[PDB]
């Protein structure tokens, strides 16, 4: 038999890791013992740009990844994830499939070893933070934690917060010590995180749609058979179906949920915020020497 | 998208069993999206890997002809990769190359190349 590896920064009981167990199980059973997945969450092999290296040198098998984190590697994939260039994960979605797409989808695998078998939904950031955010000057001098990549760093400093880069595993303890004022993610999340017990509002800010995508070392694929790569993608596709759905359904609910919390939830205009991407879009089509931009946001 | 422009420097005669700092400038695309490299080639020979750094300094790799002699060290304030070459033997000699990319890869070429610095270790 094979025991595949999969590595992810979500901890158990993230809404990542109940799929990714699910995944386990699924493959566990209609493979009848002959693929298992071994699971090992919470960034114990660092954080997703480590295990994206660790699949490339063929030392780990499987790791989630977000399509505009790919922008790591190949950099005309970081516009997907561009702040509000993607409207909703059925337009990111088609991004994944469309001629661009598929390019990428090809380069990854024969420079890197990624074979992306599937992107699944995780939700739209939002922000929370300590103080309400009514409008995007409230923005002005918030500490706002960002992840450990270029467009949630830039989504902070163009509405006007001063960023401060933290690994996943780190918030919560900077938001209840209030070493930083913010942060911003999807909902599903800052629950399973429990970000909202020591977080006070919640901004909606629709700002970036993140994907969830599943990716295999290239490397490990063919050293799979042929009934093996069926059962795997499938049962890819038959979490991600649950995944992306299980994610809707929550979105839907847990804004009243943060409500019966105490949490105040703001929406704040958000058309000062698409105004301020201008610049930054116009320059990204400059550093790729090709516009894609008015491509992505078009499709 | 934008690239990488890169060229050493340090190349120089140097006797059995001692050390040599070779450094590389980087230019162009941001230095910090980038696995900095370093490679050796003798007249003829296929490219040797040496050594590589991850973006922020955390992994280092290491080929096992220079595992215990020579490190390697990034400044992305400066946007220098160096390679700290010590108890140099004349087999060492070669042209040294810059190389990035935007991960540590085995299967392939680097994306972006310096022009090379001739190392000459001397018996």
């Known amino acids: 038999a094979t025991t595949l590896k999969m590595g992810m920064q979500a901890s158990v009981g993230s809404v990542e890791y109940n799929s990714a167990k699910m995944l386990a199980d699924t493959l566990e059973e209609m493979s009848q013992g002959e693929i298992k997945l071994a699971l090992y969450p919470s960034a114990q092999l660092g954080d997703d740009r480590a295990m994206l290296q660790q699949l490339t040198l063929g030392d780990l098998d499987i790791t989630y990844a977000e399509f505009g984190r790919m922008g790591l590697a190949i950099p005309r994939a970081e516009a997907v994830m561009l702040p509000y260039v993607a409207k909703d994960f059925d337009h990111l979605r088609r991004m994944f499939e469309s001629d661009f797409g598929q390019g990428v989808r090809d380069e990854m695998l024969q420079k890197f070893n990624w074979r992306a078998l599937d992107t699944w939904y995780n939700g739209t950031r939002e922000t929370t933070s300590n103080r309400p955010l009514n409008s995007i000057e409230d923005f002005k001098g918030l500490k706002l934690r960002v992840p450990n990549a270029k467009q949630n760093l830039n989504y902070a400093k163009l509405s006007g917060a001063s960023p401060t880069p933290m690994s996943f595993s780190e918030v919560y303890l900077a938001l209840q010590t209030n070493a930083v004022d913010g942060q911003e993610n999807p909902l599903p999340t800052i629950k399973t995180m429990k970000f909202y017990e020591v977080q006070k509002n919640l901004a909606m800010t629709h700002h970036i749609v993140n994907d969830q995508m599943v990716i295999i070392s290239e490397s490990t694929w063919q050293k799979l058979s042929d009934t093996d790569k069926d059962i795997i993608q499938k049962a890819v596709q038959k979490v991600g179906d649950a995944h992306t759905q299980t994610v809707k359904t929550q979105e839907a609910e847990l804004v009243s949920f943060f409500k019966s919390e105490g949490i105040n939830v703001t929406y704040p205009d958000l058309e000062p915020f698409r105004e301020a991407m201008q610049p930054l879009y116009k320059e990204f089509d400059s550093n790729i020497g090709q516009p894609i931009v008015s491509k992505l946001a078009a499709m | 998208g934008s690239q990488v422009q890169l060229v050493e420097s340090g190349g120089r005669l140097v006797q059995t069993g001692g050390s040599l700092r070779l450094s590389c400038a980087a230019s162009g695309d941001t230095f910090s999206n980038y696995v900095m490299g370093w490679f050796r080639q003798a007249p003829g020979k296929e490219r040797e890997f040496v050594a590589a750094?991850?973006?922020?300094?955390?992994?280092?790799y290491y080929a096992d002809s220079v595992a215990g002699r020579f490190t390697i060290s990034r400044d992305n304030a400066k946007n220098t990769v160096a390679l700290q070459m010590n108890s140099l033997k004349p087999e060492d000699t070669a042209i040294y190359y810059c190389?990035?990319?935007?991960?540590?890869?085995?299967?392939?070429?680097?994306?972006?190349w310096g022009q090379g610095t001739q190392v000459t270790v001397s018996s």
């Open positions: 750094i991850s973006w922020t300094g955390a992994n280092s």
């Open positions: 190389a990035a990319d935007h991960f540590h890869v085995t299967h392939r070429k680097y994306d972006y």
